[PDB]
Structure 1
Amino acid sequence: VPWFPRTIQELDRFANQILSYGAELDADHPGFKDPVYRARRKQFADIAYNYRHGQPIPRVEYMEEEKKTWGTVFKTLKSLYKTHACYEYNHIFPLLEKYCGFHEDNIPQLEDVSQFLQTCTGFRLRPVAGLLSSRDFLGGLAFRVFHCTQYIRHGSKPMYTPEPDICHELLGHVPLFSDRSFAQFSQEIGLASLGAPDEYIEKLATIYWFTVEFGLCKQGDSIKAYGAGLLSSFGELQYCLSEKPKLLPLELEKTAIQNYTVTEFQPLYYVAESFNDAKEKVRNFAATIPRPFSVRYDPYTQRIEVL
């Protein structure tokens, strides 16, 4: 049985376990030839590397160049939310704009966003240097902890990023983590991953992809997007609700083994009846995972109870 954190503080062991050679080092990366960008990324990586549970997330003064990139992404995407984003998203966005500083001329500080999420569902953020294993990233969700990037994409291509960056985290993920039902749903995924075999972790990663990242949900007699990858993608967000993509009901037995690529728009999306239904489906799927025990999270003591 693979090791897993029993306390929220134990998530600290995750920092010393990431891909040390990030994407910013790749020749095809938008900022590859930018030494200033290289150092800025390293600066953000060090903040995450030195962060420890409990401490407030270090505030950072973003440069004008970075705020411009943010403004571009903010302005373009926001024009689609009212008609394409699920109710949960639109209901909370006005609140984020007023209490977290969500504006095109300002990049929200993770500390303020984390406090806001805590007040909403107890979800909190932890700055992350780079890509974590699926096991570690999903494990955090069990404690309602989202490993969040703080750096921003390179300014040369504001409408594109080969990795998650702050625009993605804040405009795509955060709004949904402010919803109780979604919070419980995402947490159910995290709980299912604790001590799960590597093979089932990959299955949960795939389920996560078709829900938290590119999921669509029913809303009355309509269908709306709730996936963070869709909500942070101007092109795919409009595409996902057109007649081009194929839509199928969310079915974990099938979804969990569905292949996909992160290079182009998804040809297929899974539609969740609701966040509560999706959560129940995850719970049922979790029961099929070979684990010599059962897990539960106790928010009172922030510990995982192993039975």
Structure 2
Amino acid sequence: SVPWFPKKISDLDHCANRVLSELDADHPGFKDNVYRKRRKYFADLAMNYKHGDPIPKVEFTEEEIKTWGTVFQELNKLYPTHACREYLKNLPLLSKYCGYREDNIPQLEDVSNFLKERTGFSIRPVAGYLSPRDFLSGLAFRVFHCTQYVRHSSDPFYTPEPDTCHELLGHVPLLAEPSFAQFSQEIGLASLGASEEAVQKLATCYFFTVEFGLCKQDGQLRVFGAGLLSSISELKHALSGHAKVKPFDPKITCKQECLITTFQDVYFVSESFEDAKEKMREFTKTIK
């Protein structure tokens, strides 16, 4: 039978809280009580959020802003030579309209309003990890489930999980691009009511495009994956020449394991967002 799926944007209220502040043993904040309480604060904001609410604005601490600034400064040195053209086109729009600065962490509500105007994408704060079914279902309504907390200050350059720096620097500039927004939405649409098997394959395709994708533009390899765009070391590695790269091909890509604690073993290159979108259309017919 077909599993429940959201039919309108407010139905995400019923799955966005089905979370699967619970830090892993190796988390840099695992023994930090103050950070643990800060994380509970953010998780509660997300749990209490309902569709239609303005996303609660947060007063970030000086420490949090310094962590953001450190990451922001170093990544921005690399984007011109590493990021895809769509990313580079939209980043300055975010400095102008959403307050992307070294000494200011943008508010999710402002970013959500910006995205709504540009592509109809919006943000929903999320407490933590959701099933791939629930997470991808948001994309069907152009909703990006977004973390609001900041990584621990002890290691600004590495995070064991998504944090708001990753969301804001990695994902948002491409969600502002219509071709990419359509590509993303169609992953979500394909997932709705799909088999467990199909959802898992869509999630892996999502991982190797939206999170760790490369693309070819004017003959050059460029980065569009958000996980790369917010990781200084892997961003450099991905275009270093020491990385294994393969063409994006959903039937093959979906067989690849998604690594968490290390660099990826392989990156997949899309010809364009339009082509990646076409390839997913062909693929989803075979699994759904």
2:133 is aligned with 1:132: no
2:76 is aligned with 1:78: yes
**Could you say which residue in structure 2 is the equivalent of 1:232?**
230
Q: Distance in 2 between matches of 1:148 and 1:260?
A: 20
**Could you say which residue in structure 1 is the equivalent of 2:201?**
203
Spell out the pairing of 1:32-43 with structure 2 (5 A cutoff). Answer: 32-43=30-41
Asked if the contact 2:17–2:127 (Cα under 8 Å) also holds between the matched residues in 1, the reply is: no
Tell me how far 1:267 sits from its aligned partner: 2.5
Q: Distance in 1 between matches of 2:287 and 2:58?
A: 41
Q: Distance in 1 between matches of 2:155 and 2:251?
A: 38
| Paired letter, 1:56 | P
**Could you say which residue in structure 1 is the equivalent of 2:245?**
247
Tell me how far 1:286 sits from its aligned partner: 1.3
Tell me how far 1:65 sits from its aligned partner: 0.8
Q: Distance in 1 between matches of 2:9 and 2:146?
A: 16
Q: Deviations over 1:70-112 (max 9, x none)?
A: 1111111111001100001110111101111101100000000
Unaligned runs of 5+ in 1: 291-307
Matched pairs, number = 287
Tell me how far 1:16 sits from its aligned partner: 3.2
C-alpha RMSD of the superposition: 1.0
Spell out the pairing of 1:295-306 with structure 2 (5 A cutoff). Answer: none
Query: TM (normalized to structure 1)?
Result: 0.92
| Paired letter, 1:85 | A
Query: After the TM superposition, which segments of 4 or more aligned residues of structure 1 sit over 2 Å from their partners?
Result: none
2:160 is aligned with 1:162: yes
Q: Distance in 1 between matches of 2:157 and 2:198?
A: 34
Query: TM (normalized to structure 2)?
Result: 0.98
Q: Distance in 2 between matches of 1:272 and 1:220?
A: 13
Q: Deviations over 1:7-35 (max 9, x none)?
A: 1110000133102x63x2x3321111111
**Could you say which residue in structure 2 is the equivalent of 1:112?**
110
Q: Distance in 1 between matches of 2:5 and 2:126?
A: 18
Tell me how far 1:156 sits from its aligned partner: 0.8
Deviates more, 1:272-281 or 1:254-263: 254-263
**Could you say which residue in structure 2 is the equivalent of 1:150?**
148
Q: Distance in 1 between matches of 2:82 and 2:220?
A: 10
Tell me how far 1:234 sits from its aligned partner: 0.3
Which of the residues 151, 171, 174 maps onto 1:173?
171
Deviates more, 1:254-263 or 1:162-171: 254-263
2:23 is aligned with 1:2: no
Q: Distance in 1 between matches of 2:239 and 2:91?
A: 20
| Paired letter, 1:83 | T
Asked if the contact 2:16–2:135 (Cα under 8 Å) also holds between the matched residues in 1, the reply is: no
Q: Distance in 2 between matches of 1:201 and 1:278?
A: 17
User: Percent identity of the aligned residues?
Assistant: 66
Asked if the contact 2:123–2:146 (Cα under 8 Å) also holds between the matched residues in 1, the reply is: yes
Tell me how far 1:266 sits from its aligned partner: 1.6
Q: Distance in 2 between matches of 1:173 and 1:50?
A: 24
Q: Distance in 2 between matches of 1:275 and 1:260?
A: 21
**Could you say which residue in structure 1 is the equivalent of 2:63?**
65
| Paired letter, 2:97 | Y
Spell out the pairing of 1:19-38 with structure 2 (5 A cutoff). Answer: 19=20, 22=22, 24=23, 26-38=24-36
Q: Distance in 2 between matches of 1:16 and 1:68?
A: 30
